[PDB]
Amino acid sequence: QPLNVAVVGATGSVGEALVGLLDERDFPLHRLHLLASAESAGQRMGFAESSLRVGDVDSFDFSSVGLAFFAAAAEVSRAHAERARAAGCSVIDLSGALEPSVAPPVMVSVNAERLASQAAPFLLSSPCAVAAELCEVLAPLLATLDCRQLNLTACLSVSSLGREGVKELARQTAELLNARPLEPRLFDRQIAFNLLAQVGAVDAEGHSAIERRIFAEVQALLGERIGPLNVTCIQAPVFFGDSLSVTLQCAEPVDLAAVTRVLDATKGIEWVGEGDYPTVVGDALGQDETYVGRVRAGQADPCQVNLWIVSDNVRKGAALNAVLLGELLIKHYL
Amino acid sequence: QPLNVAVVGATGSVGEALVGLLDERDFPLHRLHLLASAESAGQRMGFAESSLRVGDVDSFDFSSVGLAFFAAAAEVSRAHAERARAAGCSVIDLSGALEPSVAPPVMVSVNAERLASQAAPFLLSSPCAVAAELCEVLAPLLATLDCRQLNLTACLSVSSLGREGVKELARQTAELLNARPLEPRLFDRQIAFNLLAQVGAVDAEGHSAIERRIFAEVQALLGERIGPLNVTCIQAPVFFGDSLSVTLQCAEPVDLAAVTRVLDATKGIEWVGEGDYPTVVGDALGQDETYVGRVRAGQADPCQVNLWIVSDNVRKGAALNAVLLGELLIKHYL
Numbered sequence: 001q002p003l004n005v006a007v008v009g010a011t012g013s014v015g016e017a018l019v020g021l022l023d024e025r026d027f028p029l030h031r032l033h034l035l036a037s038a039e040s041a042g043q044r045m046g047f048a049e050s051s052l053r054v055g056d057v058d059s060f061d062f063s064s065v066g067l068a069f070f071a072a073a074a075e076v077s078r079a080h081a082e083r084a085r086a087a088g089c090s091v092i093d094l095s096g097a098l099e100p101s102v103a104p105p106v107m108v109s110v111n112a113e114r115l116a117s118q119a120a121p122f123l124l125s126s127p128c129a130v131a132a133e134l135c136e137v138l139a140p141l142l143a144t145l146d147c148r149q150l151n152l153t154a155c156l157s158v159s160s161l162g163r164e165g166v167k168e169l170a171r172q173t174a175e176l177l178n179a180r181p182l183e184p185r186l187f188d189r190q191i192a193f194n195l196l197a198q199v200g201a202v203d204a205e206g207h208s209a210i211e212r213r214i215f216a217e218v219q220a221l222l223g224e225r226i227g228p229l230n231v232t233c234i235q236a237p238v239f240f241g242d243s244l245s246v247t248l249q250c251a252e253p254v255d256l257a258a259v260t261r262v263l264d265a266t267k268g269i270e271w272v273g274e275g276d277y278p279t280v281v282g283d284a285l286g287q288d289e290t291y292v293g294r295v296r297a298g299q300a301d302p303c304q305v306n307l308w309i310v311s312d313n314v315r316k317g318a319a320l321n322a323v324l325l326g327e328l329l330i331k332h333y334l
Numbered sequence: 335q336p337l338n339v340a341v342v343g344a345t346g347s348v349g350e351a352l353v354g355l356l357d358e359r360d361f362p363l364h365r366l367h368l369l370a371s372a373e374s375a376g377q378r379m380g381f382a383e384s385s386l387r388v389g390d391v392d393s394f395d396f397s398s399v400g401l402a403f404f405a406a407a408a409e410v411s412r413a414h415a416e417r418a419r420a421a422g423c424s425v426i427d428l429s430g431a432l433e434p435s436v437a438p439p440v441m442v443s444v445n446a447e448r449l450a451s452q453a454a455p456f457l458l459s460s461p462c463a464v465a466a467e468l469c470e471v472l473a474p475l476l477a478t479l480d481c482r483q484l485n486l487t488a489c490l491s492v493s494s495l496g497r498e499g500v501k502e503l504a505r506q507t508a509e510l511l512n513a514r515p516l517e518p519r520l521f522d523r524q525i526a527f528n529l530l531a532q533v534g535a536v537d538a539e540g541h542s543a544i545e546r547r548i549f550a551e552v553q554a555l556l557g558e559r560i561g562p563l564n565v566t567c568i569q570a571p572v573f574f575g576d577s578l579s580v581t582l583q584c585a586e587p588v589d590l591a592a593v594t595r596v597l598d599a600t601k602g603i604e605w606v607g608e609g610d611y612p613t614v615v616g617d618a619l620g621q622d623e624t625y626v627g628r629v630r631a632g633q634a635d636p637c638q639v640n641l642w643i644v645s646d647n648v649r650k651g652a653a654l655n656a657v658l659l660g661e662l663l664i665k666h667y668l
């Protein structure tokens with residue numbers, strides 16, 4: 001009957017956005033429990049004008065809740081998500097720690113019908129921001145387009161590395177601007193005014209962890225309706241938001257008007273045309289729409305279509321998608 | 335007998351780098367004439383420890399020189415490059431103003447054999463930095479790889495817009511960092527900590543001028559040895575250097591070792607492996623090598639290979655390529 005919710009990792013940037021969204025969207029919960037690692041435990045957070053104590057995830061009784069959003073480090077998910085589900089609590093894990101089979105990635109806008117096959121209590125993953133934003137835009141297009149090759153170049157902001165990344169960028173930028181010795185802390189090289197070729201270390205085949213994750217999730221979410229995905233994630237000196245440059249190679253010449261029509265008609269997507277474009281700073285930050293522009297064909301190949309996508313990785317790609325999934329689970333998986 | 339050289343646009347950032355390279359590389363000139371628009375005329379520049387007056391291009395007698403580097407605005411080239419050639423002066427135009435047929439793009443590392451068919455006085459284009467850096471890396475690979483599709487996402491620094499772009503970025507960044515009202519001048523939106531989807535306005539088919547240029551030059555330079563090119567140029571909040579993310583779709587599974595071997599063996603290219611990568615700030619700025627890293631196959635497709643390329647757009651992509659072409663014209667087109 002009453003729905004009790006836990007938010008694990010509540011003090012992180014994604015956890016915090018998710019709690020604000022529960023309040024904003026009037027999520028129909030009875031009791032809300034905010035949890036973090038013993039580190040962050042004991043501090044207070046605002047919710048619905050009231051003030052809540054963050055508790056230690058290690059001490060928490062998950063039988064007390066009916067739904068849990070895991071927005072903490074992957075190690076927290078590994079340590080607790082399955083145990084939480086055994087306790088009767090449905091889990092939405094944003095860290096992807098238990099992908100691909102124990103906790104399959106699910107998105108309402110993409111593969112919601114994949115819920116119909118699990119039995120409650122659920123244990124699901126909500127995709128990383130980049131994969132969520134790519135798939136949200138591609139899903140409605142794939143009813144019309146036959147995509148044979150998909151190229152993604154993702155330019156990631158430093159918020160992808162959490163609040164310390166935001167701090168590192170601001171600090172490095174300042175040191176340089178008033179001519180002080182640059183001293184990197186989170187990195188071993190300059191990130192200010194620089195583009196890094198990769199995000200984090202690469203494996204023996206040259207792929208980074210985020211690239212692996214995006215790849216695994218896109219193939220779980222979209223499946224067979226696309227051909228080979230090629231993913232590059234670059235680190236940009238920007239604070240917030242994902243900026244994606246996508247090329248689709250299709251089977252047939254692309255009806256560009258139909259593409260922009262579909263994007264324009266889809267809820268949660270804002271189509272930008274007439275030679276203007278969205279940006280993370282100008283458009284994406286702090287709001288729910290994923291913005292899509294620069295829809296055009298190849299200069300040579302009418303069978304190619306490019307898209308430019310910008311979205312708030314914290315609020316939209318991660319948090320709102322997780323909450324929308326929770327809203328779906330409430331709605332008909334009562 | 336004696337070789338007299340003019341540098342048109344000598345006070346611009348590319349013109350200045352080119353003059354320094356003439357001195358550094360001991361270009362065998364007799365007299366050097368520095369020229370600019372009446373704007374910049376009258377100011378002095380260093381060359382070989384001596385001090386030279388910049389003259390007005392409008393007043394200049396091109397019969398006095400045997401070779402001219404046009405590193406000025408495209409309008410200066412349109413107004414003077416052909417007239418200069420009629421006067422007996424061979425022209426290397428870096429602005430691309432007279433492409434593709436009047437002044438064909440030529441690169442020593444790529445299509446030098448295209449010189450063998452024009453008669454002196456020459457009138458040639460040296461490619462824009464991005465096209466030069468792409469082609470320099472692809473040319474030696476195409477002897478081994480059969481490239482069926484080429485995807486380029488180019489992340490351009492603000493120096494691509496000249497010195498005013500550098501100034502705009504520094505000023506906007508500073509305004510934000512000490513919490514002052516942001517006021518864009520060169521742009522109508524924020525560039526600081528932002529990624530712009532395009533560089534400049536787009537045409538009716540959605541392509542920007544730089545994208546058109548890169549496309550036309552790559553097809554003139556590489557020709558038939560590659561399939562369709564797809565180009566996106568993004569504006570990054572970085573001061574100097576081009577950062578390129580390239581995907582090649584090949585006919586056969588790519589021998590990655592052979593790729594890195596070729597790149598490692600090619601003069602002017604620095605191959606970076608072992609999971610490290612070059613950046614514009616860390617590696618490219620102020621030097622001659624074009625750095626290439628992140629050589630890997632697709633996660634799904636062994637027929638795909640990715641490359642990451644960084645180069646100094648001013649010194650290397652534009653200026654050094656132009657000078658190398660001039661050195662070739664001296665060497666056996668005496």
